[PDB]
Design an enzyme around this catalytic site. Structure first.
Site, short mmCIF file in Angstrom:
data_model
loop_
_atom_site.label_atom_id
_atom_site.label_comp_id
_atom_site.label_asym_id
_atom_site.label_seq_id
_atom_site.Cartn_x
_atom_site.Cartn_y
_atom_site.Cartn_z
N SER A 238 3.32 1.66 5.84
CA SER A 238 2.52 0.62 6.46
C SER A 238 2.61 -0.61 5.57
O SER A 238 2.16 -0.58 4.42
CB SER A 238 1.06 1.06 6.62
N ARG A 239 3.19 -1.69 6.10
CA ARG A 239 3.40 -2.87 5.28
C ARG A 239 2.10 -3.62 5.03
O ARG A 239 1.95 -4.28 4.00
CB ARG A 239 4.44 -3.79 5.93
#
Ligand SMILES: Nc1ncnc2c1ncn2[C@@H]1O[C@H](COP(=O)(O)OP(=O)(O)OP(=O)(O)O)[C@@H](O)[C@H]1O
Ligand SMILES: Nc1ncnc2c1ncn2[C@@H]1O[C@H](COP(=O)(O)OP(=O)(O)O)[C@@H](O)[C@H]1O
Ligand SMILES: Nc1ncnc2c1ncn2[C@@H]1O[C@H](COP(=O)(O)OP(=O)(O)O)[C@@H](O)[C@H]1O
Ligand SMILES: [Mg+2]
Ligand SMILES: [Mg+2]
Lengths: 517, 338, 468, 46, 464, 50
Positions: free
Chosen positions: A371-372
């Site tokens: 998850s950026r």
């Protein structure tokens, strides 16, 4: 007690107010037709992507415009098309009704109800191809969107306005994860505060009707139909409907988003939409590329998924969170459409069949899932408790080769192995059972503070559940503090530790041992 | 609560079913009522008058297959023909039309000659030399000059060249008609022939084929359709020429195109009007004036009665239709009911 | 007002009609082949309106002997097949002609084979188990009464044998009507099924519709629609439970792909037609149970070249409530039925429907088999002796479990000479619970191969020198 | 209980719908004449 | 002299012009969508001359709502972007329009984005080193002035901080400027980068050009050329060193492939455009040193299927001079920048270029780090004490070396009050030579964290 | 109606005919054998696969 008065009044109002005054109309003629595509001469002033009317109330969309004729994708009842039929132009590009009345309803990609519950009162209309919020119309994604799944909420957290891909082979548990997220939004709905409420849009593309019915039943059982809309394009629908369904769902969600609401939209699944668009393009003789897809399939998905945004405070602060689903074949994430969607989204949850068969459910591969947005989408308590999860699980996967040589391993390696086994057991979760953020925090606290070290692995799950029950029945103040402050205070932490120790005094291992100390 | 919701929803569904049944019965009853109302031809006249009034209230507003090069070259050729025909006599016009038709048929037959004359080239004088060496003195001066002009300009496709020649021939004959002062009669005859050909697919198919000898097809048309006593000579000649020069275009479509060209020669716009019954002189003048006002340009109305109209008028101009048909109103009623 | 043949190329025929006499899409037209040897009447289904009053059609019969310019007649309607109780006990072809009694059924009611699927509001999920008596199917891939069941597999893995087994187990004692659709399969298999149903006395309750692999692509495209039309009549009009058997549904897609390129469609990936998913969706969505009207459909889905990623089976997977996937590896190991326990799935295999015990036992079996699959390569290279003691125990348990999932089937006797067997669900769950706990670890693995319940296991173990 | 209530309500609704269908048959004529007049553009009682 | 739309097929538009007014290839034409909901001005780029006065163009914006026959106006020049110092501190798209202030820069000097590389005789024949001032880069993976540096790293590895650090160092040390080219930029990430640069106060030194994901392939194809044109103006007209950031170059290649497919071209191997190498060369050859000034580029590269032999990465790596790999393993240790010293590499780490002493010291550092990596498994499982005495000595030395590769970055000052450090190359070489000899093995490990040269090392040693 | 798969690897091993027993099958089975052969070779193929 149906009184004829209402029927008579409605029909009288219809007939009395019925006026069909002649209006100048541009009309073409169907020059050919085949497998859902109609080529129509005339209509010189037709717009690209305009909606066209064919006899019998049939609808088409003008996609190919050339000097000779117009290529039109037929949206249904294609068998009714015939050479020589008169085609009228509506003067409008594709648009759908939007409003709060769509909550709890099942509609087709045109917004027409298909659940048999009557008309839907539309607040207004939205064109399907309105531009996404501009780069300067947004703000950083910071509000958590709790899915209720510990693995996602701790390892790959999702923030409001984020696009999180759910990618995996068939029967790996993707629809389950999305439905769990939608169900988890129920407490936020019951709060009644629009800043916390999340409106859900479930777009079903290419699924068989009974599967959509099963999903709707699952949502109703959890009370999610109160705040959920379903846009359905079953397998029997025309390729145009499958191509347009995600855009219809996005338009409804966008109407909600631009009014300060927060929206969660699930696309189940974009691979079917890409296949339908490829079918349309091939039938229109557009040049094919890799896997026979047209040269704008990446554009298709990217334009769809960039409408999911966290709006700036100037625009009301609304947001739409995307949960596109992608079905891989033999776990080939290198395929064309998976590659495109992975490049487009802000993070990926990779689900695997081998993990699923191993009992790891949800079968999320924490090693490759990312998850950026990251910790920006987590509350402080989750950030604190979940800080060490990633490294611990990586070390556990490294050490798994030495499962049977624990005696040979030094103390640190054996401790890491046991902790990782317990954490993997902790991240397991039953279906249709999302957890509140406070309960997730407490469970991860159990996992990462060594309070499961004395518990046998095979019992961990049960232990956790029972513990979470015990607190909720006797020490809810811990949950209340976590929920209100979004952090685990020192006093709350010590009270939780004492409660855990007493419960351990009370808990029974399945093998008759003792979990104390 | 779910059960109560289901009960209420089924109640509403039954209400909807009753609404639909009542609406369908009402639509059927209204259809019968209006069918009775149109029994009197005065009712049809009144409906047409009301629709014409609506058109009077309606606000006004504002060949395409040829490509760029071919369209420009055909424009040049027609301008050259207009310059040539400044004072040409009617007999000369007939002779020029016959010679142009012969040249077009020759270009059709001599495929190699047509290809060599149609291949684009910047230079034109050698083309003129070839044309003169071909038919410098066989045909009159005007035809030779027109063919020179035709071969001079650039054509996007080879076939267009032949078309251009044929077009010129038609214009010449129409010019003769204009000199005869009978363009109304030729237009009427051409529209009549187009309408009968459209309603008689077998004759259109037989005449459209180009494999059979042209002379035989012209003779068949004469002894079948255009050799009748009450036929305008100019329209018959034009129809015979076009059928003899048919490259594959469907006969009914070709005749409709001929009529469209004949009307456009005056600058008018052809409006196809379908009516329940024949209009009156006052009605015809009213409709012509209102259509001209709406489209600005003068409009020639080709009335075509159809009984399924039941009233009003269905006008078609260009690619745009105004459907005053009472049948259209009934369809709208039958599709608008909940 | 009749058309004429213009172009002929394989099974695709172009027909030109007069103005305003172009047949509607899917209309059936008739043409004559007058050559004595091949004399017949071609039925052509209108597939496309090409413009200029031309229509492209698929011939339902071979076009050999067809002549350009012959008269083509329009029937004004799609292909229609007889419907009613009279079709039971008879064999039909895709066009509704009665093969075993020519001329039979010509006076029945006739239904067009092209039909819209049930409305979404009429659809109802089905979550009732359909016990079969097969250990692997009952345990790991429980079938659904009124649901959609498929048997996936490559060529020659046992799809047809399992279809016959399920006809034996389910259709024999079925109250309602059965419909069998032979779609592009072997004529010998069709004759064998016909004779077997006649001998079993099930034929009187069964309607058979055969379009064989020797037929032109149009017949293989439309035979499934014909059989489904009969089944739909039984579901909607007679209002009785219907058993629908299709073998092989992949042939519908294959024939579509065969004619796609001749219809002028640009090919999609892997050589399939661009409209694969849409046509399959229409056909499959017609095959369903509505509220109060049950159709239990079982379909054999051929997997080309054993490639489960192939677009045809991949698209088909979405249309099934339960899928039993047959594996070439399992077949080659001599395990029958060659079910892949790790790849197969069922929507009703959850604790709520099948109960906690069944679900737990099935999950434990799947976990053990998955671990064994993981360890197979290590065992092959370094041998079992290099595994941990717990892993050795798991490997032995997994080998016994995988052997015990095999079973002697009623339809398999012709291949082995061993009479078949049936195992109740409770016995299956108990036996696999015992196996997963290692209670039979002392018995040789060969004792678990091709048997029924625990009594058969004890008898075979005794025959092999061990005591259960 | 929900199934029993659903069936009883279905029977009640069917009976009520039959009664309403019988009742409404009188007023179709007037509204149909109104519709015919509206589409024709001339108020006609017929 | 104006054209008209004849055919519309998605982003492909055919336009017919009068006989003598056909636009040149790559000319920018303007059309109008007047439908209220989708009203806009389409910019078409002339891609092909179809003959008979027809041209085929790629629409830079979606063609929904476009009507056949609408007037098409030829601008007389290809897509032109504004140039000058005024573009710094602002966000533009591939067409030169300012996104944060519409209409801004419309009066600046405008340069066509299609330009030839420097003349062969004007190219510098001798490679030069770009002294960044970062110990890890300068010692192990020196950056080539006017060269190309691939950047590899997942999320949460410091890539954004590294980009900010390079912006700071080019602006301060070299007195240069930076152009960021977001190819296939995610709008969320573009906005985040905009706000981050504004907060760090480096936005004033950066010009941002975004070709977003939700735009047709044409703009995603041309945004890189737009940013390169701005950088070229800065290099050639302002005589400034320029640092050009491309993210992601693979998305530029994929946009080119999509455009080639849309135009009906037959795909080459693995489905890429036939002119893949030609397009990549045209883009990359413009990034060079010329007339004493240079454009240095740091480009994020995506490797499909992790297959380095894939045509896209294979063509990209034909132009790359250095590789910097950012590893989460290094980041977790607190070593900043999180450059993997073993995975990263440079093509100029050759004695003929950097000198014999530099190469010797770098090779010694690499050898020590590699041996430490090898012993890592034994340390982790069998325990440190299991190792021999020489192994323990090398583990200590390697730990000190790897912590010394960390540096206090200028971009990190916004997080910690301490400012950044710039270590001259000679100081770095001598310091790491001393460290490899074991002359600082007795010092505490923490003394080697986030410091500059030897003076900082001594200062922090006295602090402990 | 079944296939006899022949392998070069089996052929070189001395297995002649080189029939791959595991993946070779007859779809008619015992119906194509005399009673004695069906009796003595009922489960030979499965035995060899195992
Ligand atoms: N957390 C879970 N625990 C146990 N079983 C689960 C879990 N999640 C999903 N399942 C089961 O796994 C099977 C597959 O789930 P699901 O249908 O959601 O997956 P999918 O990948 O969306 O499938 P499909 O390919 O059919 O679309 C179903 O039986 C579901 O009940
Ligand atoms: N249960 C079984 N026991 C023994 N042999 C079997 C069994 N099932 C299949 N076979 C063998 O495998 C062959 C393939 O079976 P069949 O289903 O007819 O082909 P397909 O799988 O292609 O439909 C059969 O002819 C038979 O010899
Ligand atoms: N040198 C450094 N000093 C302090 N913090 C850092 C440093 N480098 C990176 N970080 C932290 O690590 C995070 C990395 O995020 P970002 O800079 O966006 O790179 P990426 O895109 O790889 O995550 C930042 O939030 C930053 O706070
Ligand atoms: Mg799913
Ligand atoms: Mg078979």
């Amino acid at each position: 007690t149906i009184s004829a008065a209402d029927i008579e009044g409605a029909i009288e109002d219809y007939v009395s107010s019925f006026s069909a005054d002649t209006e100048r109309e541009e009309i073409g003629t169907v020059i050919d037709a085949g497998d859902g595509i109609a080529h129509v001469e005339g209509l010189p002033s037709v717009m690209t992507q305009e909606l066209l009317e064919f006899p019998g109330g049939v609808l088409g969309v003008a996609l190919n415009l050339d000097e000779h004729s117009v290529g039109a994708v037929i949206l249904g009842e294609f068998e009714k098309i015939e050479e020589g039929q008169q085609v009228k132009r509506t003067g409008e590009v594709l648009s759908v009704p939007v409003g709060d009345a769509f909550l709890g309803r099942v509609v087709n990609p045109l917004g027409q109800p298909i659940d048999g519950q009557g008309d839907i009162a539309a607040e207004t209309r939205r064109a399907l191809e309105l531009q996404a919020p501009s780069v300067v119309q947004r703000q950083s994604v910071s509000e958590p969107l709790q899915t209720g799944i510990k693995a996602i909420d701790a390892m790959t957290p999702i923030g409001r306005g984020q696009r999180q891909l759910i990618i995996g082979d068939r029967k790996t548990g993707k629809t389950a994860v999305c439905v769990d997220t939608i169900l988890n939004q129920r407490e936020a709905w019951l709060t009644g505060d629009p800043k916390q409420q999340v409106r859900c849009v479930y777009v079903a593309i290419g699924q068989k009707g009974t599967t959509i019915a099963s999903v709707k039943r699952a949502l109703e059982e959890g009370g999610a139909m109160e705040y959920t809309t379903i846009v359905a394009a079953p397998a029997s629908d025309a390729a145009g409907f499958k191509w347009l369904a995600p855009y219809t769902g996005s338009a409804i969600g966008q109407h909600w988003m631009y009014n300060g609401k927060h929206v969660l939209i699930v696309f189940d699944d974009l691979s079917k939409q890409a296949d339908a668009y490829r079918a349309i393009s091939l039938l229109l003789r557009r040049p094919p590329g890799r896997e026979a897809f047209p040269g704008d399939v990446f554009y298709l998905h990217s334009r769809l998924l960039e409408r999911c945004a966290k709006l700036s405070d100037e625009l009301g602060g609304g947001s739409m969170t995307g949960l596109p689903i992608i079905e891989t074949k033999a776990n080939d994430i290198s395929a064309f459409i998976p590659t495109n969607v992975i490049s487009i989204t802000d993070g990926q949850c990779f689900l695997e069949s081998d993990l699923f068969n191993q009992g790891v459910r949800p079968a999320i591969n924490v090693g490759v899932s990312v998850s950026r947005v990251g910790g920006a989408a987590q509350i402080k308590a989750m950030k604190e408790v979940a800080g060490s999860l990633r490294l611990d699980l990586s070390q556990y996967r490294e050490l798994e080769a030495f499962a049977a040589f624990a005696s040979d391993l030094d103390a640190a390696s054996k401790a890491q192995l046991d902790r990782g086994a317990r954490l993997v057991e902790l991240l397991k979760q039953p279906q249709y059972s999302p957890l509140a953020v406070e309960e997730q925090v407490v469970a991860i606290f159990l996992g990462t503070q060594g309070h499961l070290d004395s518990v046998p692995v095979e019992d961990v799950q049960r232990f956790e559940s029972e513990l979470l029950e015990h607190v909720k029945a006797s020490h809810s103040d811990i949950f209340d503090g976590i929920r209100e402050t979004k952090k685990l205070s020192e006093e709350a932490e010590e009270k939780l530790v004492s409660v855990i120790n007493e419960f351990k005094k009370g808990f029974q291992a399945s093998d008759g041992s003792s979990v104390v100390v | 609560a779910q059960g109560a919701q289901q009960i209420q929803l089924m109640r509403q569904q039954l209400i909807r079913q009753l609404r639909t049944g009542l609406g369908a019965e009402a639509v059927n009853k209204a259809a019968e009522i209006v069918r009775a109302h149109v029994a009197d031809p005065q009712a049809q006249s009144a409906t047409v008058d009301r629709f014409l009034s609506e058109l009077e209230q309606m606000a006004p507003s504002s060949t395409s297959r040829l490509r760029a090069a071919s369209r420009q070259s055909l424009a040049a050729l027609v301008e050259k023909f207009d310059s040539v025909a400044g004072g040409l006599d009617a007999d000369g016009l007939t002779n020029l039309a016959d010679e142009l038709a012969s040249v077009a048929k020759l270009l059709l037959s001599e495929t190699a000659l047509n290809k060599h004359l149609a291949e684009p080239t910047d230079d034109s004088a050698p083309k003129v030399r070839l044309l003169e060496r071909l038919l410098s003195d066989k045909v009159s001066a005007t035809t030779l000059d027109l063919l020179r002009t035709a071969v001079s300009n650039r054509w996007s496709t080879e076939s267009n060249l032949i078309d251009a020649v044929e077009h010129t021939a038609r214009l010449a004959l129409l010019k003769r008609a204009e000199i005869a002062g009978e363009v109304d009669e030729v237009e009427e005859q051409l529209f009549r022939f187009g309408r009968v050909l459209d309603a008689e697919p077998r004759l259109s198919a037989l005449l459209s084929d180009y494999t059979t000898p042209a002379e035989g097809r012209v003779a068949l048309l004469d002894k079948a359709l255009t050799g009748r006593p009450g036929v305008n000579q100019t329209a018959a000649a034009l129809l015979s020429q076009t059928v003899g020069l048919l490259r594959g275009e469907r006969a009914d479509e070709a005749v409709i195109d001929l009529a469209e060209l004949a009307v456009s020669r005056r600058g008018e716009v052809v409006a196809h009007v379908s009516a329940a019954a024949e209009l009156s002189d006052a009605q015809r003048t009213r409709l012509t004036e209102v259509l001209s006002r709406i489209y600005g340009r003068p409009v020639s109305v080709q009335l075509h009665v159809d009984p399924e109209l039941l009233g009003g008028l269905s006008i078609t101009v260009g690619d745009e239709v105004i459907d005053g048909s009472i049948a259209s109103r009934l369809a709208a009623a039958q599709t608008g009911l909940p | 007002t009749a058309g004429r043949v213009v172009r002929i190329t394989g099974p695709v025929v172009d027909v030109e009609f007069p103005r305003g006499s172009v047949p509607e899409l899917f209309n059936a037209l008739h043409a004559e082949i007058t050559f004595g040897a091949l004399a017949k009447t071609l039925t052509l289904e209108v597939a496309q309106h090409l413009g200029d009053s031309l229509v492209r059609c698929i011939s339902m019969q071979p076009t050999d002997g067809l002549v350009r310019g012959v008269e083509v007649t329009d029937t004004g309607a799609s292909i229609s097949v007889p419907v009613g109780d009279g079709v039971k006990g008879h064999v039909f072809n895709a066009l509704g002609d009665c093969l075993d009694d020519p001329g039979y059924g010509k006076d029945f009611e006739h239904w067009s084979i092209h039909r819209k699927p049930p409305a979404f509001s009429d659809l109802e999920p089905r979550t009732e188990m359909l016990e079969t008596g097969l250990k692997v199917v009952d345990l790991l891939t429980p079938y659904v009464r009124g649901g959609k069941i498929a048997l996936f597999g490559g060529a020659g893995v046992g799809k047809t044998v399992l279809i016959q087994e399920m006809i034996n187990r389910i259709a024999r004692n079925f109250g309602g009507t059965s419909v069998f659709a032979g779609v592009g399969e072997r004529t010998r298999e069709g004759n064998d099924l016909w004779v077997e149903l006649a001998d079993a006395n099930v034929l009187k309750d069964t309607a058979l519709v055969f379009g064989q692999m020797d037929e032109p692509p149009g017949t293989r495209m439309r035979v499934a629609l014909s059989a489904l039309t009969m089944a739909e009549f039984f579901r909607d009009e007679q209002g009785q439970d219907v058993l629908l058997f299709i073998d092989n549904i992949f042939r519908f897609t294959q024939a579509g792909s065969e004619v796609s390129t001749l219809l002028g469609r640009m090919p999609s990936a892997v050589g399939y037609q661009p409209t694969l998913a849409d046509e399959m969706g229409e056909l499959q969505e017609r095959i369903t149970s509505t509220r109060g009207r049950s159709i239990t459909s079982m379909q054999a889905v051929y997997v080309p070249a054993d490639d489960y990623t192939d677009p045809a089976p991949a698209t088909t997977f979405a249309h099934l409530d339960a899928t039993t996937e047959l594996s070439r590896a399992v077949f080659s190991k001599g395990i029958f039925p060659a079910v892949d326990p790790l790849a197969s799935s069922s929507t009703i295999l959850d604790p709520a429907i099948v109960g906690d015990e069944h679900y737990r036992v099935a999950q434990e079996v799947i976990r053990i088999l998955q671990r064994y699959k993981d360890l197979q390569d290590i065992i092959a290279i370094l041998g079992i002796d290099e595994l941990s003691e717990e892993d050795k125990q798991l490997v032995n348990r997994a080998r016994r479990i995988e052997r015990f999932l095999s079973q002697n089937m009623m339809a398999a006797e012709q291949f082995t000479g061993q009479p078949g067997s049936t195992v109740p669900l409770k016995e299956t769950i108990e036996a696999f619970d015992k196996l997963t706990k290692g209670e039979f670890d002392h018995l040789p693995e060969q004792a678990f191969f091709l048997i029924g319940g625990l009594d058969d296991l004890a008898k075979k173990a005794e025959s092999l020198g061990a005591k259960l | 209980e929900v199934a029993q209530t659903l069936t009883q309500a279905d029977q009640q609704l069917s009976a009520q719908g039959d009664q309403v269908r019988s009742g409404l048959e009188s007023s179709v004529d007037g509204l149909s004449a109104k519709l015919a007049s509206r589409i024709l553009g001339v108020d006609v009682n017929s």
